[PDB]
Design a protein around this ligand. Sequence first.
Ligand code: ZN
Lengths: 70, 58
Amino acid sequence: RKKKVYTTPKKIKHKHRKHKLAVLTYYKVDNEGNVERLRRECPAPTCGAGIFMANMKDRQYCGKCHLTLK
Amino acid sequence: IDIAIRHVLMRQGVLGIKVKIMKDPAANRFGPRALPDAVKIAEAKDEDEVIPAPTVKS
RNA sequence: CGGCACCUUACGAGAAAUCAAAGUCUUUGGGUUCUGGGGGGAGUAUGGUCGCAAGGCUGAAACUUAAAGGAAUUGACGGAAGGGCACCACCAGGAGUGGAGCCUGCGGCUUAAUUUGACUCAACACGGGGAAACUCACCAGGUCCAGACACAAUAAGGAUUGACAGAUUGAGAGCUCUUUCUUGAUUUUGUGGGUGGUGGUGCAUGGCCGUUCUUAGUUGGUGGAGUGAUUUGUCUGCUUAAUUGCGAUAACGAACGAGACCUUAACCUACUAAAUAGUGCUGCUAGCAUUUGCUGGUAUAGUCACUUCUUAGAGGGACUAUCGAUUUCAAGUCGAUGGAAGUUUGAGGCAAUAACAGGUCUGUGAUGCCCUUAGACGUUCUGGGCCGCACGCGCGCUACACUGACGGAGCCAGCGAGUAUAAGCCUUGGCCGAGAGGUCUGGGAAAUCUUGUGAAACUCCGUCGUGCUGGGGAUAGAGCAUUGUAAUUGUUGCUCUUCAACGAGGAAUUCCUAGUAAGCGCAAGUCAUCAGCUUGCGUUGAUUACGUCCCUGCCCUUUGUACACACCG
Ligand SMILES: [Zn+2]
């Protein structure tokens, strides 16, 4: 019974930020060597080896179990 | 009296129906077998012959 | 004989109304004059003729139209008549309302929204609509897809979802923005397809409800009338609550509705039983007089009896019964007698033929169509609203004092409701609190306990003493609790204080005939809290009629109609 008129601008939903081969960054391969594991995979009892923290500013986080260090 | 109302789906709208059906009172086996005002008179047993004064000993 | 006519019947005529002529007319012919060929245009134009004129007489066509019209029938309507019924009419009364404040609703006004439906009865304490949140449909803000399914796009070198720190936001919404983490083919884009709406359309509908009208009305079978649609039955009179009966009768006998029927109230010492009801005895016990008497408690073993009262199941009981009258002596009615009941025994439930532009898409996963459908009119959550106030109106409650206020003392009803791992019911009994309220136990899933819901009017005893008084509790402040996340626009209560109009209500108008009206309280509902409201129940309990058509309304008949979409024609 009233034509809904807006004032605030349209808000746009977040799009998951895409990267090319994010798997590459977590490791360094050494000739005649083995895995590096440079991103400090989570040692919590919930998630085991192979999936890593997030080297943010002053914190390191993994989305699967919510915690940050330092 | 038992009734059943249904709305049969038409493309143009709703068509409601009612069906009212009576079992015959003589066909009832559970409640009353007739109407409240149904008065059924039995027929006369008269028109017999009476003789003056005998005695019947069996 | 002539006339003006009238009454009955219809051999006969007619479409019928009707007609002794409108008969002797498809069985068509006594003589003769005049006029008409669907409705309009139009008795108009023009010409002619008569007239002082007004006009008279004669008198078209173009064009336009599918009808106009006659008689009768059913209905509808009538500012027509005649009857009937009715406390949604009156008589005689009672109680009021309408005058003050206040709760609530309507319109109006304001508003950010003050959502809206409804306006004579049949709108306005109605939507069970007593709205903090939710309801909510509104307003200012913010999320979610909870967009199924077939495709085209993208996608493993990842289609994309969840997200720690900060920023922002009302928000500790990863809603978003910097942050680069994290799961992995569920899934991201466009279309088709949808899905959902307290969105519009109740004047597109269903269903339900209200109204006609709970009035008493409605219909066919055979027969009679009429060419027929239809009519009679289905009606002058009396009677009844009543189309219900008597009675009269071209009708006879039936069906629906009414009445019958069902639920509830009254009777049952007559049956059937009841420790979840009571009583009397008997024990065990307590008080007072001592008469052996009178009042309690206890007895789920006193291993008592009984159903009078309490409960319900099988029944009986009333059918105007008997008698006087009145009347058609009929249907009935009025006075007495008995009876539990003699008003339809009381009160309700159900309730006909078709119908209404009565109300509701704001109850439904009930729907057709229009709109939207991802920045959603879906949804969710935040803050506000329905309450908002110069105003008119309605349903009501307090009251206007003394048949009364309080303060003591007496102390009697009935309908009902109730929980377990909940998310909290009724809540006793005890213990605190002036109160409201607080604490600890128990019982009851239920004639057990809440609860004898020990209610108020009322009864008795004193204070007040006609004063706006101590009748009334509006306006307003402070403090104390409960309810709920959240009480501010005071939820609600309590304590103190504040001491408003109101001194009986103009014009109008409402309800009502016996446990009725009027007072007086209690329960269930909407409920986390809130009842001045309804729905029920019970206490006390009347005045006057038991008649009428004067007002009103409706029904029926007669009547009128150019209406039938039916006078809102
Ligand atoms: Zn981890």
